[PDB]
Amino acid sequence: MAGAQDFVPHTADLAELAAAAGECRGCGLYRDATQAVFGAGGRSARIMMIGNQPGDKEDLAGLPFVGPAGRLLDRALEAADIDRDALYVTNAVKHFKFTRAARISKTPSRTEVVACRPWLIAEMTSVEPDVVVLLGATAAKALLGNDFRVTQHRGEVLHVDDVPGDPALVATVHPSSLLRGPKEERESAFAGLVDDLRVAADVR
Ligand code: SF4
């Protein structure tokens, strides 16, 4: 009776989960958004990556990480030599939350994050990843609690006992943060993202 939970079907099939998410009304965000954006990859993936929400391009492409942030992330994954076939990539909330200016993303509230978390739990349960990479604060707090700071713990192998399957957890920055800033800072941050991805990839 809470959030998206009744919209989630009793199957681990990612195709069926994604179809069902197309119908979710688990919070208000389905109203203005074009469609739900489910994650992508297969259930044998070892590494799950969780961003914050679909962006402008993702909302219309119907897949996660197709915009500039995805291209930067792809460059980081390549530099970490993580095979893109080992990846299931998704977001903490599945409907683009936005405003327009004369589309701009707006932060999902904790309520929206918790409302949508059943989809994320269904994905984690379906994929059974060895490691979950949390890309930025919103994703991290979904799983690690609303007080958690990515800045104080990024690149640490974490395990919290209330997360299904007890996967290793590695929090890092969201790739969108590495698009706007000074070059030396963007280059320094890029190297830290590669580092955090390598930590996650070396689990097991
Ligand atoms: S953001 Fe998540 S909970 Fe809210 S309507 Fe979309 S799929 Fe359902």
Numbering used by the authors: 1 to 102, 107 to 208
What text appears in the publication on this structure?
UdgX excises uracil from uracil-containing DNA to concurrently form a covalent bond with the resulting AP-DNA. Structurally, UdgX is highly similar to family-4 UDGs (F4-UDGs). However, UdgX is unique in possessing a flexible R-loop (105KRRIH109). Our earlier studies allowed us to propose a reaction mechanism of UdgX, which involves the formation of a covalent bond between H109 of UdgX with the C1′ position of the target deoxyribose sugar concurrently with the uracil excision from this site in DNA.
Based on our previous structural analysis, we had proposed that E52 participates in a catalytic dyad with H109 to activate it for a nucleophilic attack onto C1′ position of the target the deoxyribose sugar cation. Further, in the structure of H109S mutant, a water molecule was appropriately located near S109 for activation by E52 (26). To further validate the role of E52, we combined the H109S mutation (where a water molecule is allowed to locate in place of His ring) with the E52N mutation and assessed its effect on the uracil excision activity. Expectedly, the uracil excision activity of the double mutant (H109S/E52N) was lowered compared to the H109S mutant. The Kcat of the double mutant (H109S/E52N) decreased by ∼10-fold as compared to the H109S. The Km of the double mutant increased by ∼7-fold, resulting in an overall reduction of ∼75-fold in Kcat/Km. Consistent with these observations, the distance of 4.71 Å between OG of S109 and OE2 of E52 in the H109S mutant increased to 5.71 Å between OG of S109 and ND2 of N52 in the H109S/E52N mutant. The E52Q, E52N and E52A mutants reveal that E52 forms a catalytic dyad with H109 to enhance its nucleophilicity.
